[PDB]
Amino acid sequence: MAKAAAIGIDLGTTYSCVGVFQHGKVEIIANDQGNRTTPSYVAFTDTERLIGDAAKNQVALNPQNTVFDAKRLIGRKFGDPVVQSDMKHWPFQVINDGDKPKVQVSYKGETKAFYPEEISSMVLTKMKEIAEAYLGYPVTNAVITVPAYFNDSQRQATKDAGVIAGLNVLRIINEPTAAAIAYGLDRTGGERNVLIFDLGGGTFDVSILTIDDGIFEVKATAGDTHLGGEDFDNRLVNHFVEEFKRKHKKDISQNKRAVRRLRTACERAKRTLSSSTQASLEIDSLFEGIDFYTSITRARFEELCSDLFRSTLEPVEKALRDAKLDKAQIHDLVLVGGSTRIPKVQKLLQDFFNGRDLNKSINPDEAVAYGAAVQAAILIKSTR
Numbered sequence: 001m002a003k004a005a006a007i008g009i010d011l012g013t014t015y016s017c018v019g020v021f022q023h024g025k026v027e028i029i030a031n032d033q034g035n036r037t038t039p040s041y042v043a044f045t046d047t048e049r050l051i052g053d054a055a056k057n058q059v060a061l062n063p064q065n066t067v068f069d070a071k072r073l074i075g076r077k078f079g080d081p082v083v084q085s086d087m088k089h090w091p092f093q094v095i096n097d098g099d100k101p102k103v104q105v106s107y108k109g110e111t112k113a114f115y116p117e118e119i120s121s122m123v124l125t126k127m128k129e130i131a132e133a134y135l136g137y138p139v140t141n142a143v144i145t146v147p148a149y150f151n152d153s154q155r156q157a158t159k160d161a162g163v164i165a166g167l168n169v170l171r172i173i174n175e176p177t178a179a180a181i182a183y184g185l186d187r188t189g190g191e192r193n194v195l196i197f198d199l200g201g202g203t204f205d206v207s208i209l210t211i212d213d214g215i216f217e218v219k220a221t222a223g224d225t226h227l228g229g230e231d232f233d234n235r236l237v238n239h240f241v242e243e244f245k246r247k248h249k250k251d252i253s254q255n256k257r258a259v260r261r262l263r264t265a266c267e268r269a270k271r272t273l274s275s276s277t278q279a280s281l282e283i284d285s286l287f288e289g290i291d292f293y294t295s296i297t298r299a300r301f302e303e304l305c306s307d308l309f310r311s312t313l314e315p316v317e318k319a320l321r322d323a324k325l326d327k328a329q330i331h332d333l334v335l336v337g338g339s340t341r342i343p344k345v346q347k348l349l350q351d352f353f354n355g356r357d358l359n360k361s362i363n364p365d366e367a368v369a370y371g372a373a374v375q376a377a378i379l380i381k382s383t384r
Ligand SMILES: C=CC(=O)OCCC[C@H]1O[C@@H](n2c(NCc3ccc(Cl)cc3)nc3c(N)ncnc32)[C@H](O)[C@@H]1O
Pocket: 015, 037, 038, 200, 201, 202, 228, 229, 230, 267, 270, 271, 272, 274, 337, 338, 339, 340, 341, 342, 365
């Protein structure tokens, strides 16, 4: 009978996504909870190891032993100043083992340490499993995506993570390249410059690629490793903490549960503001038994985040300088990442490019896995 399909995996910093190309189209595969993306989280508890949604769901009750952001560590030396800085903000412990970082947790009443690629292999095992549940057979072939700025060590560590997960890694391909492939930008048949604008939950990446007769070349990478959707959630939280202080003469900041409930409501209101011009938040007994009701306009949220949204143009200008290109030399614009749904973000980018269209019809959280699935089917065909 027909041979097993190959899968395309977007191994993201905080979320992952798996796709399969069958019958001339991409199927993004839903997980056991019916979700088209899965958190890249591994939680270690007194009795089990949780991966994906189950791990993300219990993070508030187990922060020291719920690992995320292993992609920020992967292929890096412990001594890397990026590792040393990032370590200061994680709830989990990072240890040194011969200039190699290991995440250290408590698991089944014992201290255990894992290399970043071991954590990533667990998230890859989950994506493999999600695909197998849908396909009804074992999956062994995969394309895995990485950021375009990844060096030899980071690319290799990701490949190691796939081989530990029991995958034959067909190719490690760049995330912006996968996004360009999802939009069929390699199927035009001369040379074109493409810009990928990737704004996620906690990272911002700009990449400039050249496409010449289906061949891709990375021309520039720029961005801000600590800029994303969470920062816009932070601006809303700070605004409402101040509004509560003004209206009730109480500071909710020192109550961990109140701050979490407020943050969760702020992230939901922010998403509403991408399709509505106003959003209401209501939280019963937020603090001191007070039911908190509030409202915010899209205009006020845009003002609260003005400098952050406006700062996304600096890596665009920077990538253009590095690629030695004028903005008029960019043929295609591609949006990736959940935060690109923000109207003001789209407006800033489009206006900067003198009204050029944005390639955004493919769900921005699924575009990379979509392109990885397309490329996996081409590569498994050639290898066979
Ligand atoms: C959730 C699955 C997933 O893979 O997330 C990856 C992207 C995560 C980041 O992207 C942000 N973001 C998103 N995300 C998609 C989303 C989120 C949650 C739900 Cl319930 C549904 C859909 N949509 C948005 C929207 N309409 N406007 C503004 N920011 C939006 C979200 O606040 C977070 O900073």
